[PDB]
């Protein structure tokens, strides 16, 4: 049984920083394309960050480029989202998703339940 | 039959117009149903998986299937084939970031079906890339469509853009007398009034009436163009209190062919405002409303047929159209189009809906 | 001379079929929109409606996709295919021709299901 478990969310003041982790059970992230998504109030689920298994390059949404970093530690079978200088707009349900493809694109094979990130002014 | 794709393309395009007209109430719109179908058919080849299925489900056919692409090439040489070079002009173009590794061998396959290529520019030099695209569109519309990509429409993070541009200035089969062109009041959606120039011509006009299921009826005229292949269909509610929303929200490419079928030539004096309309339509919301949502969404869009090296999504999908209706000069009962009316340019042999729009204020 | 005479009604069991019909005369059928209503100490509720040409149709919420309205302008008739009938559909079904502001009514047809 494959399961993805996100953690690290919580409440933090505006401009603060938080590190999200997603652990995998039942499979390994190796050669999967990995993406962090989020669902803010009043908005759709939107892509935040992506590691394309084609060459391991990282990509970011326009609103978080330069602030967030995505990475994967295969020795720990864990994917991370380092969120720096957080803004009230970054408040959302953050969940991780993996897909057996060379780039991040729908549909995804597995995804976790998500963790709540709340940013206060 | 090669006319099987002409109806699917027009049925899909008119459906796109409905989403535009719904979001653009009270505002002038000139649109090309065949144009958005032609460029969305090109986008089918660049997409894959779920994104491609959303497009094919909404368009109702696959560009890959046998005969589809050759039929569309035959349909193009059909509409841009009766020496319409100075009257009609269009261009389709997809632009992708230039140092992005594309699928090897895809471009010769894309070229085999459309006889054009996906163009590559460097969006990191924003204004140069914006200039190259605007120059490509302008030189391909005989210089009639300028600044399709406005300032700020793209930035250094843009990776993929779809553009579609059309110009139309067809001369009617029988010109409106320049002497009969007069000034007349036009009644607008808000009940206000404005004086505008209107042409005039008495003739035996192909005409029919049309009543919506609720009992309101409409006048529908056909104005033939030179060459006897194209015509413009005018349609407006008989009562000025009925908004054009009632007509456009039930509009279909099939319904237009039913109008033409039940038409008879009657001697009428028609006064019709001159209009020169130019519209840029952001195809995002209209195409999303028809199920094509993945292609615009980062890390959801599937463009693996175009690139399986980096993720891609459509930053902009824009159509810019310019239409001109004038006296077309060369060398009795009344129908007054003095309220918001609908116009449709149609290729009658194929049933293709080339142009379509609402004149809310000429 | 203006007359709309509906027919086709009858008694059926739940889930049965019924094919309504209404012969028109005395006016320009081609230019009028055709509709179908129903009543039983209540108001006449719209059930179906069709444009004069093009086949633009419109239906009430209770009909869903169970009733289909059609017309044959050459034979000057409006039809109502009633399938999957249910106890809520038991009513007197009236036809009507409308080219606003002119409306003509029929006499009705009684549809009753067990
Ligand atoms: O398009 C091309 N190459 C290219 C590559 C990168 C960028 C751009 C570009 C153009 C404008 O902005 C960027 C173009 C091309 O070779 N086409 C063609 C080749 C052969 C034939 Cl027979 C027809 C065509 C055509 O297209 O009709």
Residue numbers in the entry:
A (entry chain C): 1 to 121
B (entry chain A): 4 to 334, 349 to 379
C (entry chain B): 1 to 40, 42 to 115
From the reporting publication:
Plasminogen activator inhibitor-1 (PAI-1), a member of the serine protease inhibitor (serpin) superfamily, acts by inhibiting tissue-type (tPA) and urokinase-type (uPA) plasminogen activators (PAs). To this end, PAI-1 exposes a flexible reactive center loop (RCL) at its surface, which contains the substrate-mimicking peptide sequence Arg346-Met347 (designated as P1–P1′). In contrast to other serpins, PAI-1 has the unique ability to spontaneously convert into a stable latent form by inserting the RCL segment N-terminal to the P1–P1′ cleavage site (residues 331 to 346, designated as P16-P1) in the core β-sheet A without prior cleavage to become strand 4 (s4A). Structural analysis of PAI-1 crystals soaked with a solution containing TM5484 allowed us to unambiguously identify its binding site similar to the Vn-binding region comprising hE, hF, and s1A.
After crystallization screening of two stabilized active PAI-1 mutants, PAI-1-W175F and PAI-1-N150H-K154T-Q301P-Q319L-M354I (PAI-1-stab), free or in complex with PAI-1 neutralizing nanobodies (Nb42 and Nb64), diffracting crystals were obtained and soaked with the compounds. Two nearly identical crystal structures (root-mean-squared deviations for all Cα atoms (Cα RMSD) of 0.8 Å) of the TM5484-bound PAI-1-W175F/Nb42/Nb64 complex were obtained after two hours as well as overnight soaking (not reported), and one structure of TM5484-bound PAI-1-stab was obtained after overnight soaking. For crystals of the PAI-1-W175F/Nb42/Nb64 complex, one ternary complex was present in the asymmetric unit (ASU). Comparison of TM5484 in the compound-bound structures shows TM5484 at the crystallographic interface between PAI-1 and Nb64 (in the PAI-1/Nb42/Nb64 crystal), or between two PAI-1 molecules (in the PAI-1-stab crystal). Comparison of the TM5485-bound PAI-1/Nb42/Nb64 and PAI-1-stab structures revealed that the TM5484 molecule bound in two different orientations, hereafter referred to as “orientation 1” and “orientation 2”. In this respect, it is notable that the carboxylic acid interacts with PAI-1 Lys122 (s1A) through the formation of a salt bridge independent of the orientation of TM5484, and with PAI-1 Thr120 (s1A) through an additional hydrogen bond in orientation 2. In orientation 1, the Cl-atom substituted on the same phenyl group is involved in an edge-on Cl–π interaction with Phe114 in hE of PAI-1. With the nearest aromatic atom at 3.5 Å and a distance of 4.7 Å to the Phe114 ring centroid, the interaction approaches the average distances (3.6 and 4.3 Å, respectively) that were reported for edge-on Cl–Phe interactions. Through the furan group, TM5484 forms a non-classical carbon hydrogen bond (weaker H-bond) with the side-chain of PAI-1 Gln123 (s1A) in orientation 1 or with Pro111 (hE) in orientation 2. In orientation 1, these interactions are limited to weaker hydrogen bonds with Nb64 residues Gly66 and Asn84 and hydrophobic interactions involving the side chains of Lys65 and Arg67 in Nb64.
